[PDB]
Every structure is written in structure tokens, then in C-alpha cells.
Amino acid sequence: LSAEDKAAVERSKMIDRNLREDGEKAAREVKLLLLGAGESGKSTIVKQMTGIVETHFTFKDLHFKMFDVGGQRSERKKWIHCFEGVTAIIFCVALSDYDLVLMNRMHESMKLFDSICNNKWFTDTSIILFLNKKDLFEEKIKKSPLTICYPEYAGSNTYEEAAAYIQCQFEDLNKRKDTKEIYTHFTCATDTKNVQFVFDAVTDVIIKNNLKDCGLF
Amino acid sequence: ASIAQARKLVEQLKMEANIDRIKVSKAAADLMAYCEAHAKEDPLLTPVPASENPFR
Amino acid sequence: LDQLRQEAEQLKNQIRDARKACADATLSQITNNIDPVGRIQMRTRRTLRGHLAKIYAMHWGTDSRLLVSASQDGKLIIWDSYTTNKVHAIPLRSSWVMTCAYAPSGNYVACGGLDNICSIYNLKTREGNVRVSRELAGHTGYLSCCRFLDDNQIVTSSGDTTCALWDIETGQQTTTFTGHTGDVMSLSLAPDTRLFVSGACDASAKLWDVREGMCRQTFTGHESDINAICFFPNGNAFATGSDDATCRLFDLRADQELMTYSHDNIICGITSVSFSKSGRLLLAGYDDFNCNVWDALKADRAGVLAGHDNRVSCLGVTDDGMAVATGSWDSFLKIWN
Amino acid sequence: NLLITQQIIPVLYCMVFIAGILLNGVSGWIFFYVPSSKSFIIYLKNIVIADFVMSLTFPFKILGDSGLGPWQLNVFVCRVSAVLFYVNMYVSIVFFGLISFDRYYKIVKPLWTSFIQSVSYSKLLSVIVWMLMLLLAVPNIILTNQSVREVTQIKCIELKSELGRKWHKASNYIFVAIFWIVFLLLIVFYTAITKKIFKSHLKSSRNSTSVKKKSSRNIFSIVFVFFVCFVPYHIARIPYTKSQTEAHYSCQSKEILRYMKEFTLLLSAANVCLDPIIYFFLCQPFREILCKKLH
Ligand SMILES: NC(=O)C1=CN([C@@H]2O[C@H](COP(=O)(O)OP(=O)(O)OC[C@H]3O[C@@H](n4cnc5c(N)ncnc54)[C@H](O)[C@@H]3O)[C@@H](O)[C@H]2O)C=CC1
């Protein structure tokens, strides 16, 4: 090879080394697609942890990149496949929105959760389901009965029973319970255990993915 | 709001309505003629010799 | 309200009547006499490897040798296709790019995507390192296509149902095209760069005058979102690939769909569309992990480019027509002769 | 006897030969399309190659053990087929060990951080492993070209020179020690992986219980197949090699030892059949390519 050709091949090899290093660094990052409704506590979760809002944070020697696609206002079907290889999906649902309306707000939230969970691009992607505003929901469950959101509800009008019923209703939307797991956490204001819950869930997901990549699960 | 959008759509349809359209036969003949003229200069229609092929 | 809707319906009926009147014959019967192109047996000459995530876009250089590609790993790689060498590797501030463009002069590269911003990078910096030269703010929706129109202005389409011609020096939208109803998914600039066609999610293609800024013609017929669009080499016709398994060739002068390119064995959507140098071959990438080379005149499937383990997301043809580069979601670019 | 190693052992060799050659030929057909994106796939490719070579050596055993065209079949099984079978068997064993170590490195993520451990360049180490195995095995075929003293009695060590016999004993002892090192490492690594799996996944849900149960079943199947196939052979290979290169100390134990060695070697050869169902099947790209082609 000529001197120019040798220099070009050397430059290509340097670029290859840099790309390999970048990919090695990126493969250790945990990708978290953040989804929810307007009334969901996505903003509070982001604050405690233009088209896409990227939040990078390190927890227990794990680097997480959380991508919020709120405000896109476009057709999800044209860009949701960009998150096909995402490590996990954090879906936020406002519990207090069971009594609210835009069609009930919680019904629209359930529809969005079912669409995200049961679409082709997230067949095996795990979902951390945050049920925010548990304090406001507990305060308002004593006056507004849960029947206005779930007419089929027959349990007692207590906070624990209603919260478990809502969580079970959201978990029953999983059409691949054998392969995909939904981690439900009751987030709220002044809650410091949400990031730890995300860390534990993504640790489980990472162990599952490592077992799958090893031909062991 | 709705009235303005409807008026804009009507104006656009009127603009796109009074245009000169040629017959489909003539346009297809022109397209075929363009394909025939540049047939020898298309390296994908016929394989270029490996001597003249930069991707050999 | 009601009167305006009635007038719009009457205008649409008049347009359809004029189109039916000017459709005396069909492209299939006119090209029925010509001999078939035969079987296309293009083979993979080069495999550009180095991308680590799904490749979403590629664009050939006007020298038909350098080739830019965009990957979801936040990388914009400029390849020397002849030697497979990597000329440049630009780290993107946003890894969610879905389009990339190469300046006709070769001095700049455009990229963009879910960040709603078109980034213009200068490759010919005196310092020897590629740095972003401009960031175009606007497009409240994701930016799906960008095409350089000389070195100072660029046409970009986005997911806010609008296109925009930007002046790169000032960074401001010189012109805005606001006729589409669905998300605009693809752009194609005419060889003279005076007109451009945009296909959108409303199953519609629109022809825009760059200088005038208004929509000249609107083309329908597709039953689903149009993902790819490409001008014929003559510039008097274009091809659209959509979410249904059919491509469609429309003609500007006739204002009608000339041809359809579909098969029963094909049920997946179409991601990329390109013509050969003569326009006789129409190359379309599909979701079934392949590319189909159709006889654009005869609508016959001339050949199949297979070798991508994932969906073919993008493909282009060199300006001299020597090769076809197809990128895929399997993080691989394949050059074919 | 006469109806054990001539009328029964060849039949079981034929059964394992067919049930290994079919699966391994299909696996080699599939693996040429599967890219080597990870060291696990590379080791599976090498294991496919080794198992195919073993299955190709099997017909020579079957025939020559059962019957001879010329005595050339028997002297050839001593000379060529057996050496290739043994070298491919030990290649498979050490590649099982390498797979175990990469699984440990990935799943466990051990305290070897700041050390590269086994990441990338696994083609080079695979090549040097093949080269070390063939460096051990080549003298066992080059040195065994002696004349045949008795035409119908052809013991594989009688066809072997003084240096040949010395290196036969050395290679056996070395290969048994290599297998035991790989076996201890495999047990340690799979115990560590099972410990890593035991932690986490505390949800009592379908997904967590399923992943724990499937991973533990796969690990137990791997370890159990490894044990049943190889431990009986290598706990009796040293006494049998002593019996081969022996000062006169035995009369009939030299026969029960040879039956034991033949049956334990048949156990070890059954891994050519038990390998796809525990290693290749669980490989996601291999299974995906097979489901795309075999439908
Ligand atoms: N780890 C090892 O033991 C290795 C051995 N080798 C070589 O391979 C050759 C095979 O040696 P061994 O198997 O220990 O010798 P052996 O006396 O056990 O039998 C030799 C081979 O001939 C066949 N055979 C011959 N007579 C038989 C009979 N009556 N019944 C059933 N099978 C019969 C066996 O299948 C066996 O593979 C040796 O020359 C050795 O040097 C090569 C590499 C590694």
C-alpha cells in the first residue's frame, strides 16, 4: 500500500478501536424508556432520579439513560421501534386519576399500558409500573368510590384493597405473563425508594438477559 | 379555526384542480423513452466488466 | 362550514374526473411490448461493518465513493466504499437519529431524528476534526428526512406534518410546507432541486415548489403510511413505498398513479425506495429482510437482494449507478453490483 | 466376549453415530449462517466441528470393531480414527470448560474486574486450544505405524514404538489431568453461576420462578450430562492405561478393564447426541436461524 493508503487504513483502524470502546461503554448502560399519561408523575420521577428528554444517572455502579418521549405528539408507530432494544420501560400511572376524566383518565392510561405492553417491539421487554400519587389516591378514596373507574369492582372501599385492585387490573393486561414481568411500585411524593426499585428490577432484567445470551435460559 | 382551515383546503384544491394534465399515454411513452435512452449507461441493467468495476 | 365542505368535495370530484379523462391508456400496456429486463443477479461486493446498532439511514456521496450512514448507537460513519475504510466517525449528541444526508459538495453531512433537530457537520474543517457546524431548531415533531439543496439551504421533513427549507447560514426556516395531514416520513429532491416530493403517514404524496413554497400536486392511492419516496432520474415521476406491500409510481405531468409494484408473497411494509441510473429498475427495501428490484416499466420483480438478517431500513444508488448500498437493522451495510 | 464388543458395542456405536451425525450435520448447516458475535457462538461452532468429526470417525469404529475388510480397517482404527476421535472429544471437553468460564464471567461478573479475562479474541484462544490438542495427539498417529505381529490379534499398543508407547502413556495421563482440571473448573464455575441465580428474582411470579427453574434445569442438565458422559471414563482411564502399558501383573482384569473402558467411551461418545439438546438448542441465534430455515 502507498503512504496515503497506509495512513487511511491506520485511520480506519483507529476509528474501529474508538467505535469498539464506545460500544463497550454503551453496552453497560441501562436503557429506560419512560412512558405515561399527562396526569402521570413522570416529571416527579425524573426530578428525583426537544423531542426526547435524556436523563443520565449513576446508581450503585450502574449507569442509566432514561429517555422520556413525552411531548413528541407524533404517531408512536413510526418511532417506537427505535426503542426495541431498550432494557426496560418505566410506565407511570396516576392512581388519583381514577376519578378524573380527559373517557376516564385511568381508562386511557390502561389503554396506553396495554398498547405499549402488547405491541410487537416490546414482546420481552420488562415494564416497571409506577403507581404515583398514592397519598392523594388514599385521601380521595374515602369520598369518591372506585366504582366510577371500575364498575365491576366489588371489594371494600379502602386504600389497600383499591390499590391492589388497580395494580391487578394493570397487571392483567400482560398477554405474555410467561416471558415478560411487570414490576409494580407505589410511588408518591417524598419517596426515596423508587430509584432503588428501578435498580432491583433492572438487575433482575440484566440477569435474565445474561442467562439468555449465554444459552442458559 | 375550522372555517379558516376549510377555506385554505378549498383554495388549495382549486389551485391543484386547474392545472395542465397531459395524457397518461404520452407521459408513459416519455418515461419509457427516458429508460431506453439511458439503458446503456446504467451499470445495474447490464454487468459492467470487472476491469471497469470499482467494486471488484 | 357545510358549504366549504361541499365545495371541497366538488373540487375533489372535478380533480378525479380530470385524472380519469387524461388516463387514456395504462403504463402496463404501453410497456407490454418491450422485452423484460430479465433476472437481476447483483452480488454483495462490500460489507461495511462497524455499526453496533440498527442502521436507520444512509446517503451516497456525489463522487459515488464516500457514503454516510447513521446508526442508533449515536454514530454517523462516513465510509470509503471502494476500500471499506472508515473516513469519518461523528459522535451524535442524540443517538435517536433516523435520517442522514450528504452535501452534494461533500463538505457537510446532515443528520437528525427524535431530537427534532437537523445537525449539519462540517467535514472540511481546517483543524482536521469534524465538528457540528449548525443545529436547525424547529419541527416540533421528529425529523424523518433531510436532503441537502446546495451547501447553504436544506430541505427537512418532520413528524409534525410539515416540511421546511432552512438557510443553514442563518439557521432559520426560509420556507415552510404545511399541506400534509399525517407525519411526513420521506423526502426526495428533484435533479434540478426546484421541486420536491414528500410522502406522509396520511397515505399521500405532495409535490412542493421550493421557490414558491406551495404544494403543486397531491397524489393518493396508497392505503397506508408512505415511508419512502424517490424521484425518477428524469424528474417527471416518482415512486412511493408504503406500509402496505405495494410501491406506486406516480407521474407529475399526468397527476396520476402510473404503476403499482406488489406481490401476494409480499405482505410486509416498504422502508426504502430508489431507482437505478436509467430508472428502469426500482429498488425497494422491505420488512421481510430483503430488497426487491422491480422492472419499473413492467412492474415485474426482476431480482432479490438478500443477505440482511434484519429489516432493510435504507438503500441508495450511486450517482453513476455502479453500486447499490443497503443498510439494515442488523447493523450492516451491504454494497451490491 | 464375542457378542459384546463385536455384535452389541458396534450396534450402539451405529445408533449414536446416526443420532449424532444427523443432528450435527443440521447444526453445521445452521451455524454457517449464525454470525460469531460472541465467544459462546464461536465455541458452539467449534463443538459442532468436533462432534461432526467424531461422528465421521464412528463408522470406522463400528465396522472395524464388528468386522474387517482387510485387517487394514482395524489397524486404521488404531492408527487414524481413534486418535481423531480422542482429540475431538478432548477439544469438546475443553470447549465445554471455556463455555462454562464465559458463562461465569458474564452472569457472575466476578472480582476479576480491571482484568480483561475472556472477552473478544476468542478465535485466537480457540485456535491455540485446537493446536495444543493436536500437538498432543499427532505423535499418537505418527509413532503408531509398526508392523503387525499377529494378523488377527491387533492390540493398539503393540503397533507402537518405545517412544510411541512412552508418549501414549504421557498423552493419556496429560489428557486425564486436563479433563479433571476442566471438570473442577466447570463444577466451580457452574456452582458460582447457580449461586448468582439463587440471589435476586424474589417475586414469586411466573416470570421469576420460570427463569430460575429453567436456568437451574439447564445448568443441572449440563453438569449431569458432563458427569455421566465423562467422569466414568476418566475415573477408569488411568487404570486402563496402566493396564495397557503394564508390567505383568494381571490376567483377567485386563479384560473387564477393557469392557469398562469401551462402555465408558461409548458413554462419552453419546455426548455427540446429547450435545444439541443441551447446548445448541438453548442458543438463541441458532434456534432462530433453524426456525427460519427448518420452519
Ligand atoms: N487421550 C487418549 O487416550 C488419546 C489416545 N490417542 C491414541 O489413540 C489410540 C487409541 O488408543 P486406545 O483407545 O487407548 O487403545 P485401545 O486398545 O483401547 O483401542 C484402540 C482403538 O481401536 C478400537 N478397538 C480396537 N480393538 C478393539 C476391540 N477388541 N474392541 C473394541 N474396540 C476396539 C477402539 O475403539 C479404540 O478406539 C492410541 O494409539 C492412542 O495413542 C490419541 C490422542 C489422545
Numbering used by the authors:
A (entry chain A): 5 to 53, 182 to 234, 240 to 354
B (entry chain G): 7 to 62
C (entry chain B): 4 to 340
D (entry chain R): 17 to 311
From the manuscript:
UDP-sugars are secreted into the extracellular space to function as the paracrine signals through the G-protein-coupled purinergic receptor, P2Y14, which senses extracellular metabolic stress signals and regulates energy homeostasis. P2Y14 couples to Gi signaling pathways, orchestrating a wide range of biological processes ranging from gastric function to immune responses, renal inflammation, and liver fibrosis. To investigate the molecular activation and Gi coupling mechanisms of P2Y14, we determined the cryo-electron microscopy (cryo-EM) structures of the Gi heterotrimer-coupled P2Y14 in complex with UDPG, UDPGA, and NADH, respectively. Despite variations in agonist structures, the active-state orthosteric pockets in UDPG-, UDPGA-, and NADH-bound P2Y14 complexes share common features, consisting of residues in transmembrane helices TM2–TM7.
By comparing the structures of UDP-sugars with endogenous metabolites, we found that NADH exhibits characteristic chemical scaffolds, such as diphosphate and nicotinamide riboside, which are structurally similar to the uridine and diphosphate groups found in UDP sugars, suggesting that NADH may function as an endogenous agonist of P2Y14. The results of the cellular assays showed that P2Y14 was activated by NADH in a dose-dependent manner, confirming that NADH functions as an endogenous agonist of P2Y14. The global resolutions of the Gi-coupled P2Y14 structures with UDPG, UDPGA, and NADH were determined to be 2.88 Å, 2.76 Å, and 2.76 Å, respectively. Unexpectedly, the electron density for scFv16 was not observed in the map of the NADH-bound P2Y14–Gi complex. For example, UDPG interacts with D812.64 and N1564.60; UDPGA with K772.60, N903.21, N1564.60, and N1885.40; and NADH with K772.60, Y1063.37, N1885.40, F1915.43, and E2787.36. Y1063.37A and E2787.36A mutants of P2Y14 showed significantly reduced activation by NADH relative to UDPG and UDPGA. Our study is the first to identify NADH as an endogenous agonist of P2Y14, supported by cellular functional assays and the active cryo-EM structure of the NADH-bound P2Y14–Gi complex, revealing the NADH molecular recognition mechanism.
